[PDB]
Amino acid sequence: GLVPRGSHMYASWTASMSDATQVLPGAAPAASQSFNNQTVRHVLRLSLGGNTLRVKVSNLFGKSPITFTAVRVAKSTGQSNIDVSTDKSVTFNGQASVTLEAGTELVSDAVNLEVAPLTNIAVSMYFSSPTAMPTVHALGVQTAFIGAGNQTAATSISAAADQSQSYYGLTALEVSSIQKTNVVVTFGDSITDGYKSTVDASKRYPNQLDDRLKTAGFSRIGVVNQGISGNRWLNDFSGPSGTSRFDRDVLNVTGITHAIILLGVNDLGFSAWLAPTQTVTAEQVIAAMTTAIVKAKAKGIKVFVGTIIPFKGASMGYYYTDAAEAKRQTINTFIRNSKEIDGVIDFADALKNPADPLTINPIYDSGDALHPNDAGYEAMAAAIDLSKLQ
Template identity: 50%
Template sequence: MKHALRDRRPTWSAITRRNLLGGALAATLAASVLTACDGDDKVTHWYGSWSASPQDYNEPFPAPPPPSFFNNQTIRQVLRTSIGGDQVRVRFSNVFGTSPLEIAGARIALSAGGSSIEPASDTELRFNGNASATIPAGGELWSDAAELRVGAEEELAVSLFLATETAVSTVHALGLRTHYVAAGNALSTETLSGAETRSSYYFISGVDVRSSARANVVVAFGDSITDGAGTTPDTNRRWPDYLSRRLRADGSAGTVSVLNAGISGGRILTDVIGPSGVNRFERDVLGQTGVTHVIFLLGINDIGFASFVPEQEVTVEQMTAGTQSMIDKAKARGVKVLLGTLLPWKGANAGGVPYYSEAGEAKRQAYNAWVRANTTVDGVIDFDQALRDPADPLALLPAYDSGDHLHPSDEGAEALANAVDIRLLEVRP
């Protein structure tokens, strides 16, 4: 059965077309519902507060982990908001599905840790007034607004009931959170005792909050370094998490939400291990509700992946052209762009295969020189300089190295967040 599902997988060209269409629809939706008035004629706004970029569970590399299906099961997924609000809505995703996604029920609540929820906060999610929904293949769907007040840096649990056999299709592979799967309809069960655990996100890609405050929404667009590989699971220590907390603690920039749009293994130009940056930028960045800024940290896999697949080698000129095309799209939408340099990676390996090479290092240096000289962006963040070892500038500082010489540790992720000039993210009248 599993192999039959893979045989029906769409081609990458089909996925690319579908991604672009889905992104355009998401951007239209985000623009159309950004502001509203409540009963007191007070202007309110919807803002993205959490995101996880969709991936195809059935792509050929890497080999997908189990399960390949859910059937009569409840999935409880835990996430953390960036900013808070008085209402919340959830985006459910079937972007990579090859058949309709049947949602039999969904609820949201404040997390009480582990698989537990705060019962008093347990709130039904409805879809155009209905308790269930069908999302067509290639589509995404926002729930209706739910009356749940959530705070900044709040732990939420989204519970999803799949009553019939449902092929796993749309995921975010590196969730770095423990999620729970229980038999039957356990949507409102306080604690899912004996539940199976998972670490990927399934069928959810975003959470918005409604607020009367004026806020900026910053999207961190990148690969595994942004996705949090190398940091401690279940601790929210990805660099966008640190940036969100830093902005809130400092307060000088105003209310700023930070969304994570990293995909481990992702590249600027080439699909597989998630859609390429140029193919997902419309949906994963410009489609976020209220987006005002994007921070780029993407490209090291375009260089290093040639160690695995030499025929996918790309030139620096191709990398810069791809990045510039996304910069131009953002600027055309009024989104401010902060462009990051690629981190030191001397000695990096991936799965035992050498990733670093002298030829690759020459490309990194050339790409970083282009970044530093780019006059079309609103700011440059020199992540390279912030994390390099002064005694060996081609390598990560040992304290910032998770051990593979490619991905930052928890301390390295915090150093990335600290390298961002938060004045560039300031909410302005």
């Protein structure tokens, strides 16, 4: 009959945050980008539609407060353009300006803009003051547009070479519905992030998963992306360690019902050359995984773990090694035999080279023997049984 009219918020799009100034042990410290009397217009693809939306802004890794002088939202018509008839002020407890102390995040007021699944909205931020921004999602696989002055309500951004592929201080977009809704969180590294998939093409594997769900009729099963390029389970860089960020980036995602966990290859590949002081074992990796899994089951989430895709050829002797291949096979065997998880997604089986299972299938090779191409990410999405996400 009639669906109960109670309304709830659901994560429709996400981006995990990193500290752009944090560097590998022994490296020279890095500077953060800054804005000064400028506007950033982000573009993001919504997984779930609904009637109102909220915007989550973040200063999680700032060293000083920042002040969002204005935040606006509108439907995207491509490039930096918006449909100004949909332009809306995003307020924070009634205010149009909001200050976030260092290490905090804030959800905005609800905004009355009806939006559809698999459509692009634009979130525009204006920083009047000189603003350091170390809280970023480094590789968005998506063009952001920067311009002088407060251009948050403009038809487009007038700049250029002032483009980025990051997200600055923007971490989540929630939308409301009365419908029953599933939120699938994909948690991982570059390969969940969608690195070497086509920019602005929405061809990350969670994008293609989302496409498959909507084609099958599940407009109310959302997929949100919580990858971080270069992420590791046991150590900071790139981005907060998988274990330290699992509470924020998986457990606290608004409305989470499912999780696909795919992380580890950087724990294996960093120790040859990038972080020799950070050699880890397959057992230490499995210990972190099961703590994450056990937490998520304790909260009612259905947990799926993906096998580590083959990566022979990926800088032989400097990322891939025989030690890494051994650790990868122990981890894959554990995943494949675990009775603690709700299910396995055999990404490795789906994507391996039939000529040589230790390498990625050449037609899915972006060319570096590690990262899939668009076809490889379509193949990852195809490997997932949609009944698991119901």
